[PDB]
Design a binder for these strands. Structure first.
Lengths: 49, 71, 71, 49
DNA sequence: CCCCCTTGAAGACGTGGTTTACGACCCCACCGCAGTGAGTGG
DNA sequence: CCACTCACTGCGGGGGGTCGTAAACCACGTCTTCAAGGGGG
């Protein structure tokens, strides 16, 4: 019981906070998008084309 | 605890060697076997003895077993 | 002590159940009909999440959970 | 006295972490260069011979 | 003191008939530091 | 135009009513081996 791991199937995809909020942001740098716009899109405040 | 239980088992084995051949199989079958637990009647037919005779034989054999162990 | 957002969503599911089982010919407003369904979903969520382990499971325990607070 | 010990310990930890992996590994190297050693004098007083 | 009975019953192990009981589901009209970012103005 | 901040951020020291299943049994019983005693100093 100290070695066996489980898993949870997510109904919808979720972003990893380490690759988002740890400066410099990896997702923002890869997408060349501002971090604020990514945060707004992720937490359901605006749309993205 | 493992050391204490191992040295007590060896005393049982040494004591069982002093028993007669017929008495050893009586104790071994009923008490030492794990797959089967031989009853009084089953040992009676194998050696042609009475049902009480098998039961009465264990008492004397166990006294000898205790005497060797306690000494 | 439970989050307000979690309680709201539990009630939303209860509201949908009352809507699916609404008879317009009775003449009563949906507000009075759905009040029993919404509070039933919230009560069940509090029982299962008030502590790390469920406190009330049987019939008698559930009655005492909501009455001992006032008594 | 009560407050300087934490700063001393932090500086010691930083020095140990930066310098921890240096070990003498060779008997001799083929270099010929070096540094110039001279006595130090400040204000006309020979501080160190 | 080896041997086969006796003879009366004490407990021994299920056992799923019989019967509660649990659990679940349904309705309810400081500290200084450094890297970042706009944000100018040019 | 890229220079030159400066505000910003992050880092260390509530009701009732049914149903199914692993508990939860009290009877259930017949098996075991409990055995009273039997004889060879």
């Amino acid at each position: 019981r100290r070695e066996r791991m489980g898993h949870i199937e997510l109904a919808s995809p979720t972003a990893h906070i380490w690759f988002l909020k740890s400066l410099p942001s990896r997702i923002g740098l890869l997408l060349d998008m501002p971090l604020r716009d990514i945060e707004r899109v992720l937490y359901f405040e605006s749309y993205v084309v | 605890d493992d050391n204490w239980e191992e040295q007590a088992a060896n005393r049982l084995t040494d004591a069982m060697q002093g028993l007669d051949e017929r008495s050893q199989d009586i104790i071994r079958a009923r008490w030492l076997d794990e797959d089967n637990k031989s009853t009084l009647q089953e040992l009676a037919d194998r050696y042609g003895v009475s049902a009480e005779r098998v039961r009465q034989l264990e008492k004397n054999a166990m006294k000898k077993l205790r005497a060797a162990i306690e000494a | 002590g439970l989050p307000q957002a979690d309680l709201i969503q539990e009630g939303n599911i209860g509201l949908m159940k009352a809507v699916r089982r609404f008879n317009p010919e009775v003449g009563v407003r949906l507000v009075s009909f759905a009040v029993h369904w919404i509070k039933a979903e919230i009560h069940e969520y509090v029982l299962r999440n008030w502590r790390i382990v469920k406190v009330a499971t049987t019939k008698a325990q559930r009655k005492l959970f909501f009455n001992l607070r006032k008594t | 006295t009560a407050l300087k010990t934490a700063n001393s310990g932090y500086l010691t930890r930083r020095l140990v972490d930066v310098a921890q992996d240096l070990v003498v590994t060779e008997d001799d190297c083929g270099t010929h260069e070096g540094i110039m050693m001279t006595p130090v004098i400040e204000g006309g007083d020979v501080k160190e011979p």
